[PDB]
Amino acid sequence: MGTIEISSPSKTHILAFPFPEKGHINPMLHLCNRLASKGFRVTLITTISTYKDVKNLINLESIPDGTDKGMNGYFNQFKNSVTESVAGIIEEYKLGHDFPPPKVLIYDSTMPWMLDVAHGHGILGASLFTQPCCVSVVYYHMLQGTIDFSSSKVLLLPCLPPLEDRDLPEFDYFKEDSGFVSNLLLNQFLNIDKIDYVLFNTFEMLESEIANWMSNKWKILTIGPTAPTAETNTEVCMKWLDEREPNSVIYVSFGSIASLTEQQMEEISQALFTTNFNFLWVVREEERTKLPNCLPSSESFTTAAGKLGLIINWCPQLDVLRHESVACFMTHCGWNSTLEAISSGVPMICVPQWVDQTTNAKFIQDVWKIGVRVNNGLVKKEEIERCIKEVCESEKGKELKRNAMKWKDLSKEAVSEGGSSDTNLEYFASTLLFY
Numbered sequence: 001m002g003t004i005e006i007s008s009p010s011k012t013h014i015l016a017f018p019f020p021e022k023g024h025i026n027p028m029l030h031l032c033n034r035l036a037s038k039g040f041r042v043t044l045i046t047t048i049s050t051y052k053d054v055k056n057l058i059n060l061e062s063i064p065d066g067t068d069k070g071m072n073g074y075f076n077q078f079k080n081s082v083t084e085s086v087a088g089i090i091e092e093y094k095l096g097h098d099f100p101p102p103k104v105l106i107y108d109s110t111m112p113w114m115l116d117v118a119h120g121h122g123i124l125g126a127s128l129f130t131q132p133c134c135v136s137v138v139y140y141h142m143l144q145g146t147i148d149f150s151s152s153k154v155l156l157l158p159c160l161p162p163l164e165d166r167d168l169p170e171f172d173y174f175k176e177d178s179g180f181v182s183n184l185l186l187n188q189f190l191n192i193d194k195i196d197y198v199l200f201n202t203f204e205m206l207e208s209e210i211a212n213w214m215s216n217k218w219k220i221l222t223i224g225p226t227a228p229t230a231e232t233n234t235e236v237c238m239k240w241l242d243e244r245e246p247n248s249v250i251y252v253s254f255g256s257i258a259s260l261t262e263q264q265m266e267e268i269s270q271a272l273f274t275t276n277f278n279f280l281w282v283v284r285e286e287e288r289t290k291l292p293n294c295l296p297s298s299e300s301f302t303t304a305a306g307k308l309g310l311i312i313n314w315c316p317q318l319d320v321l322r323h324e325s326v327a328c329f330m331t332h333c334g335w336n337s338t339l340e341a342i343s344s345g346v347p348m349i350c351v352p353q354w355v356d357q358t359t360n361a362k363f364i365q366d367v368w369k370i371g372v373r374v375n376n377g378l379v380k381k382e383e384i385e386r387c388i389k390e391v392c393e394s395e396k397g398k399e400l401k402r403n404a405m406k407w408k409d410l411s412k413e414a415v416s417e418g419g420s421s422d423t424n425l426e427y428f429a430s431t432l433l434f435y
């Protein structure tokens with residue numbers, strides 16, 4: 001005689017709150033699906049403006065965007081507003097009757113003060129880093145002042161390859177804002193010893209040495225890629241790709257924020273309109289006016305080489321990357337783009353722009369050996385064409401593609417049963433249930 005209590009995922013309530021930007025929303029969202037696939041109740045909290053895009057099982061809550069229409073004023077208003085409204089949501093659910101009360105807030109690692117919201121409301125806090133281990137450690141070392149950041153400089157950090165100046169995360173691009181952006185990334189570590197779960201969207205084999213190094217300081221859980229293994233304009237892009245030859249398309253995307261200069265846009269244009277390959281070039285709506293005048297939701301071309309090109313304002317990038325028609329990825333090397341390509345086996349042309357893109361480029365070409373970085377800071381048509389020849393028209397290109405298929409298989413192994421990422425995510429979920 002007596003009573004039994006069962007803690008299952010279905011009675012455990014996970015809150016998620018990403019920073020409102022696609023390279024932060026996207027990997028959170030994938031992780032919420034995986035967690036829901038594991039039976040938990042998952043509520044994704046998101047700003048009202050991102051709510052729409054996102055809105056197109058997983059619970060969805062909206063909060064006020066909390067930001068009048070510079071980087072700094074926007075951020076302090078944001079910090080202030082979302083601190084209040086997320087704290088309010090947590091309390092809403094603690095009294096609710098439908099859902100279970102929340103056990104843990106997963107928050108983007110660029111909002112470390114959300115650990116205080118979570119703890120200060122008596123729930124666990126899980127920090128999701130949306131960048132690899134190797135660049136995150138650089139931010140930590142800059143935070144610590146572990147080293148000094150007519151001569152060139154090379155930095156030697158434990159468990160990392162030598163880093164040239166150009167290999168460091170690029171903050172100076174932001175000029176008077178470099179201090180804010182740099183602060184934002186280093187402050188990911190202000191309370192690292194206090195975070196209940198430290199999650200990294202990466203997989204162990206990709207960053208063995210530095211991941212183990214961070215594991216001996218912090219019980220970090222590498223859990224990526226969060227995206228599934230084998231979006232606006234899906235049907236359009238797949239139709240066009242379905243009708244191209246295999247291994248014939250150069251996929252070109254510079255992410256969701258970066259915006260190249262008129263001159264740089266022209267360098268790329270001339271390289272792609274004269275190359276021996278088809279091309280699918282994402283050019284965001286707001287960026288379209290920076291195109292060469294010689295060229296609206298999409299545009300179809302016959303290139304001067306007699307090939308075919310499609311300019312479009314947004315695509316399902318993951319599905320493009322996994323289409324047999326894609327030869328290579330010309331990318332700005334944001335970490336989501338880099339990891340999606342890794343998990344798809346697509347070799348890469350690296351045109352890094354700022355923050356962690358420069359360091360990702362370093363690793364893509366020199367550590368993982370799955371792509372080439374362009375040399376500058378304007379990048380000339382001729383330099384783009386050299387890199388296309390390297391990656392798509394050369395025996396080197398062929399080894400690069402082999403390298404990428406090896407990393408893709410390792411990536412699929414990591415998130416499959418008994419994979420290192422599958423283990424870590426199961427460690428997250430199982431301990432969530434513990435008394």
Ligand SMILES: C[C@]12CC[C@H](O[C@H]3O[C@H](CO)[C@@H](O)[C@H](O)[C@H]3O)C[C@H]1CC[C@@H]1[C@@H]2CC[C@]2(C)[C@@H](C3=CC(=O)OC3)CC[C@]12O
Binds near residue numbers: 023257354
């Ligand atoms: C600092 C900021 C936040 C990070 C954003 O993107 C990153 O996402 C990935 C991490 O998961 C990386 O892999 C990507 O390489 C990286 O691009 C972009 C950077 C830089 C731009 C600024 C955001 C934070 C918001 C920001 C301040 C917004 C803003 C502009 C302004 O004048 O007031 C507000 C818009 C972008 C922004 O400048």
Ligand SMILES: O=c1ccn([C@@H]2O[C@H](COP(=O)(O)OP(=O)(O)O)[C@@H](O)[C@H]2O)c(=O)[nH]1
Binds near residue numbers: 022313340
């Ligand atoms: O046409 C596009 C271009 C980009 N993306 C997605 O937007 C994210 C971009 O994140 P990333 O870290 O690569 O760079 P950021 O945009 O933050 O600078 C990735 O998940 C891409 O797959 C997309 O869905 N469609």
